[PDB]
């Protein structure tokens with residue numbers, strides 16, 4: 029009955045890039061979802077499976093927390109069955125998603141003097157990412173009939189691209205730290221309750 | 223608004239240090255490209271000191287200037303081609319009368 | 325192609341991936357047997373500038389196409405390349421430039 033460590037996921041200092049989103053398994057702990065729903069700080073709290081303020085006393089065998097950083101206009105793509113360059117090539121939630129999506133603006137933590145270029149996303153990819161797939165490889169995407177041979181050039185684009193987060197961007201173009209809590213149920217005793 | 227290049231096709235032998243001058247009088251941002259015969263020119267040194275994502279053939283991407291007798295001093299392993307320089311002041315984003323190494 | 329000495333010029337290249345705040349898209353001549361000459365760059369926001377040549381080229385990232393036109397093509401014959409500039413340090417994404425190939429002749 030030790031409290032689940034949400035102070036290491038939400039309060040972490042270095043959130044992972046979206047194309048290499050950090051994944052943390054949570055099990056064998058009691059989860060308190062009351063310090064979370066009514067924190068009044070999260071700009072986005074959308075639960076696509078179990079209703080938010082009822083899953084406090086609901087038990088799951090594993091809670092997988094996916095942490096990353098995306099733009100404000102790209103948090104609408106963290107949902108089952110969506111489009112864009114985040115649901116397609118970076119992080120695709122399955123159509124049978126059973127969990128919650130949490131997103132709080134981080135213009136005070138991930139925007140530097142002239143731009144925080146430390147967060148990247150997968151701009152180019154051959155095929156869309158299958159649900160919960162993670163493609164960290166930086167192979168040179170090919171956009172023409174000419175073979176790339178591993179040397180980057182015209183028609184051979186570097187797949188990744190850098191968010192230009194600044195403190196003086198529009199509300200859309202400001203960073204939003206995002207944590208996706210995906211609950212799963214298996215044929216094993218539940219270990220995550222409230 | 224010239225970028226006069228002095229050497230006029232210097233060449234002695236392979237495996238030697240060749241120094242190409244760029245005696246342009248200009249502000250910063252002067253770039254260096256290499257073009258092999260019958261090929262598309264490619265970037266070597268963008269902001270007059272740094273190195274592009276490449277040059278793994280001698281890895282002697284040399285830029286020592288901004289006093290504007292600019293220089294690239296590099297080795298010559300199997301890497302014979304023509305070498306060009308480019309101003310960046312955005313009205314005449316010009317090039318230079320590059321030199322060969324044969 | 326073997327364009328006529330006053331038929332308008334028109335070349336196109338395929339460019340993918342937006343206009344992310346620093347990206348050039350320039351066009352470079354190369355007269356046959358002579359040194360490099362440049363014709364126009366379009367920056368990432370909207371800024372288009374040229375040489376004293378009256379070119380009329382425009383990029384468009386939707387439809388993913390760079391277009392380089394002209395008006396008069398008297399006698400010029402060269403080899404035209406499509407560059408891709410990034411002259412602003414974007415963190416991991418180093419500034420770069422990469423060129424295509426393509427020719428033109430007149431009569």
Ligand SMILES: *[C@@H]1O[C@H](CO)[C@@H](O)[C@H](O)[C@H]1NC(C)=O
Nearest residue numbers: 034035037038039063064067
């Ligand atoms: C993060 O830490 C602060 C104090 O250190 C605490 O008030 C807050 O609840 C923590 N965040 C979460 C999600 O528990």
